[PDB]
Specification:
The structure is a homotrimer. Chain A has a two-stranded antiparallel ribbon with strand order 1-2. Helices cover 52% and strands 3% of the residues of chain A. The relative contact order of chain A is 0.18. Chain A folds into two domains: 206 residues, no CATH class; 121 residues, no CATH class. Chain A is an all-alpha fold. The interface between A and B is large, with 43 and 43 residues. Bound molecules: a molecule of 2 linked components (NAG-NAG) (3 copies) and bromide ion (18 copies). The site of one bromide ion has 5 residues of chain A, from helix 2 and helix 6. Chains A, B, C: VSG forms a coat on the surface of the parasite. The trypanosome evades the immune response of the host by expressing a series of antigenically distinct VSGs from an estimated 1000 VSG genes.
C-alpha cells in the first residue's frame, strides 16, 4: 500500500536544511587594498633609487615580459620583474616620488632595498593566503555534498544498474545502509521521497504535497532528475533560507545525527535511518507501506558511529572549516597590513637619510 | 471550543529560544591599552623635539581647545592638537623623555615625526573600528527582533485597528501570513499564546501553564502588554538561558525554520505556520479549537522561502554578524598593536640618532 | 511496571550529543615557527655585536644555567640568559652573521639592542598566549562536563549514600530537581537509563536496546560504572560523531534546553525534566511505569531559568569559549609575526649602519 502522505515530512525538513545551505549566498574573499598600495609605493621607491637609466628602461619596457641591451635585466630578474613593472607604472603616471628621484649612498640604497624587498614579501604572502582559492574549495564542498565528490547534477541523472529499491535505499539488515544512501544528499532524498513502483497518488506525497508528484519509480537505472528537481525545489518551503555559516552547518548536522540516530521500527531495530520503517522494518526500505518495509533511507551504522559517513557530512564539515578559514583570512590580512604599514612608515622616513 | 492546554507548547519553546537570546548577557567592546600608551609616548616624543617654547606653550594650554601669541598654533592644527594635548599631559607629569628633551637635526626631527604621525594614524584607525559602535548595533538588532525596527515595548502596546484575529494571525489562505505575524517576536507570541475571546480557562494555556492566565482577548486595538509580560516571562522556563553567540542564533533560526516549515493541518495545506491548525486549518488562525481554525501564527510563505521573512530573522542574523565582527575587532586591534609596537620600538632606537 | 522500551530514546539522543562532543577529536595549539626563527636571529645578532670575548664565553657556556670569571654575566642576566643561549646556538652552528661578527659605535650597538630586546618581547608575548594552556583547559571542561568538576570516571563509581531513586533523580516537587541531576552528564544518564530495582527486562531498554542490559538497580551507594560504560558507549549510535566546535556545543545546548523545557506529565506540571514522567509525575522520578512516577531526570527549575544549572552546561559553555580562544590564538600569533618581521627587516637593514 502507499505509505501515508506526510509520513516522511520531518525527515524531509531535516535533509532540506542541508540542501538549502548549498543554495545560500556565499561569502566574498577578503582583499587588502592597503597591501597593494604599499607594494606599489615600495616598488616605485625601489626602482626610483636605482638611477635614471634603469628607471627609463623599466618604464620603456613595463608592458614587456622579462623574456641584453635592456639595463633593467641587471637590476631585476624574472622573479622581481613584477616589482619593476608595478614601480614603472607609478613612475610613469609621479612628482610624489620626487624626494626619491635626491642622491643616496650604496649603503643607503642597500638598506632601502631591504625594506622594499620585505614589503614585496608581504604582498607575496598576502597572495598565498588564498592559494588554493578558498571560495572554490567552499563551492566544491557544497556541490560534493549534493551530488557526490566531483559530480554534478547531470552526472548523477540515473540510478545504478542491477540493484533493487531495497538494496539501494535500505537492506533487510538494519545496520548495513542502502548502497546509494549516504553518498549525496540528492540520492538520500530520492530514496526518501521518490515514487515506489506501485504508488497510486499518496505515497508520492510521503515527504511533501508535491506538485507535480514524483513520477519515476525508484528502481535500477531509473532516470530521476525531473523528480529530483521537484524534490529539491520544495526544500525552501520546509527548511527556509538558513545562512551559509559554520554555525548553521554544524547545527544542521547535529539535528540530522539525532534524527537519524533514534532507532526506528516497532521493535526499535532499524538503526541510523531516516524516513519511516513500516512495522518492524525487517523487510528493508522497499518504499511500500502496510507491512514491514517502508519508505526510508538507511545509513551505514558503523560509518555513522565513527564519523566517516555519510560522505556528505564530511563535505559539509569541510565547507564549515573553509568558512572559518575565510573569516580568518580577513584577520590574517589585517596582520599583514600591520607589517606593511610599519615598513612603509620606516621607508618613508628614510627619504631623508 | 478552547484549544487544548499545552497544544502550542513546542512552538512556544522554539520562539522562546529567540526571546531568551535577547535577554542574554552581552559582550564587551574590545579595547587596546597598548595602543593608547604607545600613542601617548609618541605624542610626548613628537612634542618634546619641537623645542622648549612649543613644549612650554602646549603644556600651558593643554586644557584649551585649538580655538596667535600661542606658538603651538604654528606646530599643530586643530587636527593634530589632540596629539599635543596627549603629549603635554605626559611632559607635565617626565624624566623618562629626558633623552628627547638632547639636540636633533631638522632631518632627524622630520624622520621622528614620520613615525609619530604613523603612530597617531594607528590610534585613529583603532578608534574607527567601532565607528559605528557595534555594541549599540547589537542591542538595536536584538530590540528590533522583539518589537519591530526602531520600536520599544511601550510603542507596541496595542494591536492594529480594523483587523480580526484571523486577518492578524493567519488568514484562510494557508500561504499568505497573518498581518501582524513575522514582524516581531512579541506579536508572533501574542498570536500563538494569547486569549481568544471565547476562551474559558483552557485555551489561555495553549502555550504554557501561565499564572496569571493571559486575560485580554486578541482582537483589533487590544491592549496586550500585560499579557506579553506574562508570556515573555515564561520563556526562561521552557528555553532556559542560551548564550548570546552567533552559534546560538543560527542554531535557533534553523530549528525555527524546520518547525514552522513542516506543513500542518489534517490535509497538510497550512504552510510556514507555528502553533496548531485545527482540523484542515482552512478557516485560518482564529484561536478557536474543535473545528477547522486553530490557535496558530502563520508566516508569509514566499518571504519565508526567499529568506526575506520573518523580519526578526533578518534582525537576528544581523545580531549574529555583529557578534562575529566584535570577535574580529579584538584580532584587528591585535594587528594594530603589532604596527604600533614595531613603530614604537623603531622610534625608541632613534633617541640615539 | 517496567517503563516501555524506547520511552526515553529522544532524551537519550539529546544528552548523547553532549557526550559525543567530549569524545570528539580536539584541536591543536597554534604555533609560530616564524617567531622562533626571528627570535633566534635577533638573539644571534644581539650577541654577535657584543664582541669576541662575550661571544666566545656565551658559546663556551651555552649549556650552563646563568647560576664571575664568565664575562657573559656582565652582558646578560638570568632574565636574558635564554637570549644568549639561543644566540650562542646559532653562532656555534654561522657565516650568515658575518656582517654582524664589522665594527659598530656604542650608539649603533644601543639601537641594535633596542630592536633585539623588542623581538625578545614578541617571543615572550607569543609564549604567554597559552599560559595557561588552553588545550588543557578545554580537556578539563569536557571532563568536568561528564563527571563533575575535577572528577574522573573512577572517582564517580558509586551513587551517594542515604538517598532514594526519587530523591536522587527527581523529587515529588516538580521544580526542585534530583539531588544527583544536573551535576554531570554521567549521573543524568544513569538516572535516565538505569535499571529500576523491579525492572524485568523492558525498563532497562527505556533509553536504547542495550546489550548487555543495565544490570545494577539505581539506589543509594549503587556501583554503576559497568552500566555507565554500556550507556555511554551507545551514544555514538544515536547521536553520531559531531565535531568539537563552539558551533556544535551551543547547538547541542539549545536543543537540550528546549527538550528539557517543554513541561511534562499529563497535567504539564513537571518542569525542566528529561525522560518521561508517568501519569501526572506527582510521585517523582521513581524509575517505575504505570502510575504517576516515571523514569525521568529532573533539573532544578530556578537554576535552569537563571543559566546557572545544569553545571555541565556551564562547563560546556567554557569549552566553547576556549575553542573560540584557540581560534583567536592563531590570529594573535599572526599579529605577533607581523611585529617580529617588521622588526627583523629593520634590524636586517642596520647591518649597514
Ligand atoms: C606609504 O608611505 C607613502 C610614503 O612613501 C605614503 O604615501 C605620501 O603621503 C603624503 C601624505 O601627506 C603625501 O603628501 C604623498 O604624496 C604620499 N605619497 C608618496 C609617494 O610619498 C602612503 O600614504 C603610505 N601608505 C600607503 C598605503 O602607501
Ligand atoms: C614604547 O616605547 C617607549 C620608549 O620610548 C617605552 O617606554 C621606556 O621603556 C623603559 C623600559 O626599560 C623605561 O626605562 C622607560 O622609562 C620607558 N619610557 C620611556 C618614555 O622611554 C614603552 O615601553 C614602549 N611601549 C609602549 C606601549 O609605550
Ligand atoms: C630575519 O632577518 C634575517 C636577516 O638578519 C633573515 O635571514 C638572511 O636572509 C638572506 C636571504 O636572501 C640570506 O642570504 C641570509 O643567509 C639570511 N640569514 C641571515 C642570518 O642573515 C631572515 O630571513 C628574516 N626572517 C626570519 C624569520 O628570520
Ligand atoms: Br495518507
Ligand atoms: Br552566491
Ligand atoms: Br626594488
Ligand atoms: Br602559487
Ligand atoms: Br528488524
Ligand atoms: Br553512511
Ligand atoms: Br486541555
Ligand atoms: Br548585558
Ligand atoms: Br607630533
Ligand atoms: Br567618526
Ligand atoms: Br486548508
Ligand atoms: Br513572514
Ligand atoms: Br515496551
Ligand atoms: Br583527540
Ligand atoms: Br642581546
Ligand atoms: Br608564565
Ligand atoms: Br505533578
Ligand atoms: Br540543575
Amino acid at each position: 500500500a502507499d505509505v501515508a502522505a506526510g509520513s516522511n515530512a520531518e525527515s524531509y525538513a531535516v535533509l532540506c536544511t542541508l540542501v538549502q545551505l548549498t543554495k545560500a549566498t556565499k561569502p566574498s574573499v577578503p582583499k587588502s587594498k592597503i597591501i597593494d598600495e604599499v607594494y606599489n609605493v615600495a616598488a616605485a621607491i625601489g626602482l626610483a633609487i636605482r638611477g635614471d637609466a634603469v628607471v627609463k628602461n623599466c618604464i620603456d619596457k613595463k608592458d614587456s615580459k622579462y623574456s641584453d641591451s635592456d639595463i633593467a635585466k641587471k637590476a631585476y630578474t624574472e622573479r622581481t620583474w613584477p616589482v619593476a613593472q608595478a614601480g614603472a607604472a607609478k613612475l610613469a603616471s609621479k612628482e610624489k616620488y620626487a624626494s626619491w628621484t635626491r642622491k643616496y649612498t650604496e649603503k643607503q640604497k642597500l638598506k632601502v632595498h631591504v625594506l622594499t624587498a620585505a614589503i614585496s614579501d608581504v604582498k607575496q604572502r598576502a597572495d598565498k593566503l588564498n592559494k588554493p582559492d578558498k571560495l572554490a574549495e567552499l563551492t566544491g564542498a557544497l556541490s560534493n555534498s549534493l551530488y557526490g565528490n566531483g559530480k554534478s547534477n547531470a552526472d548523477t541523472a540515473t540510478l545504478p544498474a542491477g540493484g533493487s529499491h531495497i538494496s539501494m535505499c535500505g537492506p533487510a539488515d538494519g545496520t548495513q545502509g542502502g548502497s546509494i544512501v549516504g553518498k549525496a544528499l540528492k540520492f538520500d532524498l530520492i530514496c526518501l521521497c521518490g515514487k515506489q513502483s506501485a504508488d497510486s497518488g499518496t505515497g508520492e506525497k510521503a515527504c511533501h504535497e508535491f506538485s507535480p508528484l514524483p513520477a519515476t519509480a525508484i528502481a535500477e537505472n531509473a532516470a530521476i532528475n525531473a523528480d529530483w528537481a521537484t524534490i529539491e525545489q520544495g526544500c525552501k518551503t520546509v527548511a527556509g533560507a538558513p545562512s551559509l555559516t559554520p554555525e548553521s552547518i554544524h547545527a544542521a548536522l547535529q539535528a540530522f545525527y539525532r534524527h537519524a540516530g533514534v532507532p526506528k521500527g516497532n521493535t526499535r531495530n532499524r538503526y541510523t535511518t531516516v524516513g519511516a520503517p513500516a512495522g518492524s522494518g525487517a523487510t528493508g526500505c522497499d518504499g511500500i507501506g502496510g507491512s514491514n518495509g517502508g519508505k526510508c533511507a538507511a545509513y551505514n551504522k558503523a560509518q555513522f558511529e565513527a564519523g566517516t559517513g555519510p560522505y556528505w557530512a564530511t563535505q559539509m564539515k569541510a565547507a564549515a572549516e573553509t568558512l572559518v578559514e575565510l573569516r580568518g583570512q580577513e584577520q590574517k590580512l589585517a596582520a599583514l597590513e600591520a607589517e606593511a604599514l610599519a615598513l612603509n612608515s620606516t621607508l618613508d622616513g628614510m627619504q631623508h637619510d
